[model samples]
Target: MAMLTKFESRSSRAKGVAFHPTQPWILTSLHNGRIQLWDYRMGTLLDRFDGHDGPVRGIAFHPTQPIFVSGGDDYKVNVWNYKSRKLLFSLCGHMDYVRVCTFHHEYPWILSCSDDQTIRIWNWQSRNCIAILTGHSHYVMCAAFHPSEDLIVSASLDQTVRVWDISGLRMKNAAPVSMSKEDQKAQAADAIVKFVLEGHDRGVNWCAFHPTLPLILSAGDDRLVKLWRMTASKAWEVDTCRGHFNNVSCCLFHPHQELILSASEDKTIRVWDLNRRTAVQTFRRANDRFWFITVHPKLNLFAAAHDSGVMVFKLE
Candidate 1:
């Protein structure tokens, strides 16, 4: 196999990138409050969306629909029908800049984290705030829904990762037990923290659940990646994978295995084998730090983002 042809796009500081689950395009969230949709192979600009007041930070494509979700430093999360490039509705609950937002695999709910020190869950279709999970003391960095379960995980600058049980939202379990006004204030400050992943000495930047398993991966300014497991007793720190020299912006499992891919300020993309917990491959660039990375949902493909643009790669 050979390196596939490279495609270029309109220049901007791309903060986040994602591929359509079933289409021929890719989405990029830019620092200029615009989102670009492009033909992945030809670099053709298909559309651009402008609705945020500040830089856009996170984006996600619907698993099987022509819809997507976005969040930004503007303190808002917007869901859109990408086919029409129209704003479908906005989920408003975060008190500060929203850093990352995503949709559940089987539910119509949106999950997001923010500088407000809390994570909010929303009903995408109903446009209603379903729950606000408060725990982190600093900016909430990244939040995502588990692929096969009713759990949500979040990373934060406060140096902790939190897992939340959202089964109540999925099956309408029951209204959470009511609380007194003073108790509510105290509880919000110290919510039920399912797990406190504590290894990164510096700020934790991103965390993600394995797309099809029970593992969690996290990256931080400490220049390391760690994997953890959720168990009946408590969350367990299972392993650590180290190969980067600078702050790792993100790390994710290859959709099919214990393999992990990470992007870092060291200007390289490294792949790790989480099964053995070691670095397996590395892709370095001539200039600029890589900020975000994504693995294709169905294909043997991956992408990385930076100042120049996004790089699409494949593995045989």
Candidate 2:
């Protein structure tokens, strides 16, 4: 496969990247307490947002809305209006740095992970916390909502990737409840652990669900990307891709292609053939450590974040 750079722009070291679902725009969370939105097609800066007190590491755009969510070392999760260039509100509950934030595909909810060792679900529409998931004994590095299910998967420094059942929370929220404090606490405890995945040799850094399959792809400090499959009764590892030379920062399954894309502190972006489980392409630049990668929802393009910038590219 041939990979071509469509456009590039410079910024501080980026910890996360997200592409707009229906537009040619990119959002990057940088090490300098700034989040930048860019027009990838024209290689121009669209807007810059600053609300966090420290480096912003997590960002995601809404699937069909004009807003985005961000989290940072300041221990805050903020909702922002991309087009209006304004902050909608800030969510504050985590005791430590927040590592990642993602929007639920069909709900008015936001999922966030933190160094405080918990994952939180927030009702963005009402600006209230819906539930807190507490099981990871170490820092929670990443958490994401399943595209079409009442489930969430999270990776942590505790060396485990956990699948959590959020259907209980959904039910509690749907019920009109004027409950006591004890009843509310019991509902929080109802968030059950669906699975505890323990195949990675080191701390897991990221995990994401397949668009239309009961599968997950996870990357970790072990320098590997592991694929997992789940059924109604059991979940197990399927295979591993083993070519990155350093800590794998992130990985994703290309929705429209039979390929897996991963980035690493080794200063490279790698593309692996899913069928062959082998590397088919690699991208590198001197003095750059790639930290993040995300695919466009409706295009064949993707964006990568590294030391000093972000690049939009397409696989040919």
> How accurate locally, in lDDT, is each candidate?
0.82, 0.89
113 Cα displacement, candidate 2 (Å): 0.4
TM for every model, in the order presented, reads 0.89, 0.94
Off by over 4 Å in 2: 176-190
Best by TM-score: 2
Query: TM-score of model 1 relative to the true fold?
Result: 0.89
Q: After superposition, how far is residue 42 of candidate 2 from its true place, in Å?
A: 1.4
Compose the digit string of candidate 2's lDDT tens values, residues 286-316: 9999988888877889889999888889898
| Best-performing candidate as measured by lDDT | 2
Worst-scoring 10-residue span by lDDT in model 2: 181-190
Tell me how candidate 2 scores on lDDT.
0.89
Candidate 1, 80: how far from true, in Å? 1.5
Mind giving the per-residue lDDT tens digits that candidate 1 earns over 1-316? 2335355564678888888888877889988888889888776889989989878997988887778999988888999998787998777778888888887777777788899998887877668887889878899898887777667788999888888777756666233466566655653422246677777788889999887677899999999898998875578788888778999998888887657888999998788887898778787878778889887888877777887777777764
| lDDT of residue 198 for candidate 2 | 91
